[PDB]
From a paper:
The FfIBP from Flavobacterium frigoris PS1 exhibits high TH activity and relatively strong recrystallization inhibition activity. The FfIBP structure is composed of parallel β-strands in a helical pattern, which is mainly stabilized by inner hydrophobic interactions and intramolecular hydrogen bonds with long α415. Additionally, the FfIBP has a capping head region that consists of two small turns and β-strands, which contain a disulfide bond. This disulfide bond increases the overall rigidity of the protein and reduces residual movement at the ice-binding site, thereby augmenting TH activity and protein stability.
Based on the CD and MD simulation data, four mutants annotated as FfIBP_CC1 (A101C-A120C), FfIBP_CC2 (S96C-L132C), FfIBP_CC3 (M249C-N270C), and FfIBP_CC4 (G160C-S176C), possibly forming disulfide bonds, were generated. Finally, the most flexible region identified by MD simulation was selected as the 4th disulfide mutant (FfIBP_CC4). To confirm the disulfide formation, we solved the crystal structures of the FfIBP_CC1, CC2, CC3, and CC4 at 2.0, 2.1, 2.0, and 2.0 Å, respectively. Among these mutants, only FfIBP_CC1 and FfIBP_CC4 formed disulfide bonds within the intended area. When the RMSD values of alpha carbon mutants were compared with the wildtype, relatively high RMSD values exceeding 0.4 Å were observed around the mutation sites of FfIBP_CC2, FfIBP_CC3, and FfIBP_CC4. Unexpectedly, in the case of FfIBP_CC4, the Tm decreased by − 5 °C, possibly due to conformational distortion caused by disulfide bond formation and a decrease in protein stability. However, we postulate that the forced angle change due to the disulfide bond negatively affects neighboring residues involved in the hydrophobic core, such as Trp174, Leu178, and Val198. It is worth noting that the initial 350 nm/330 nm ratio for FfIBP_CC4 is lower than that of other mutants, including the wild-type.
Author numbering: 61 to 276
Write the structure that this text describes.
């Protein structure tokens, strides 16, 4: 079996970025959100959009913000360790599956690697036990089309799925995603897309009327 990616303090966040969080009102986020080292003014969420705590490095940001530089410093550092751990896994089970377009696949547990932009234009299933692990290594961008749903089968849990992307993620409008996203750049969601997972971006997270839930 594949070892879990350890997220350390970043596990406590539904959204964690380095250059902020933009939003087209209204989104529904369940879990804590933060950004560091950017000012909390870069978190464009309202208090009614977050069930959890909004963390700021400073006195700026949404009215309900909690200022805690040292926790955000640890979280972002733990996110970079996680990113490097996920990107550093060797001996993949698959390389360039579906020639970088994986619509209609059922993905069984293991380490997958793509030396390309990964596209998900139609529904996929992730199928495995409640203890199985998936690590998806994407050297490029990751695109999922409007209305595409990731279905979990067999007991597979969102908390045991990790998507490591060297490029930006784009989740199309009304798409449903499952798993943790460790992005070296942005995570960009569209109109009423949902995610059961964490959005961990070393640039920005951008939302448009999204539902975001930390995995349970």
């Amino acid at each position: 079996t594949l070892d879990l990616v350890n997220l350390g303090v970043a596990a406590n966040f539904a959204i964690l970025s380095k250059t902020g969080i933009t939003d087209v009102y209204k989104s529904a986020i369940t879990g804590d959100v933060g950004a560091s080292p950017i000012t909390g003014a870069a978190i464009l969420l309202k208090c009614d959009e977050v069930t959890g705590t909004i963390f700021s490095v400073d006195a700026a940001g949404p009215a309900c913000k909690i200022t805690d530089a040292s926790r955000l410093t640890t979280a972002v550092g733990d996110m970079q360790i996680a990113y490097d751990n996920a990107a550093g896994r060797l001996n993949p089970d698959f390389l360039n599956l579906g020639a970088c377009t994986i619509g209609g696949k059922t993905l069984t547990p293991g380490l997958y690697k793509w030396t390309c932009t990964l596209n998900i234009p139609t529904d996929i299933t992730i199928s495995g036990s409640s203890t199985d692990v998936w690590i998806f290594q994407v050297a490029g961008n990751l695109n999922m089309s409007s209305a595409v749903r990731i279905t979990l089968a067999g007991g597979a849990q969102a908390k045991n799925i990790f998507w490591q992307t060297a490029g930006a993620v784009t989740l199309g409008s009304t798409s449903h995603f499952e798993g943790n996203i460790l992005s070296q750049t942005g995570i960009n969601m569209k109109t009423a897309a949902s995610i059961n997972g964490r959005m961990m971006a070393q640039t920005a997270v951008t939302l448009q009327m999204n539902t975001v839930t930390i995995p349970q």
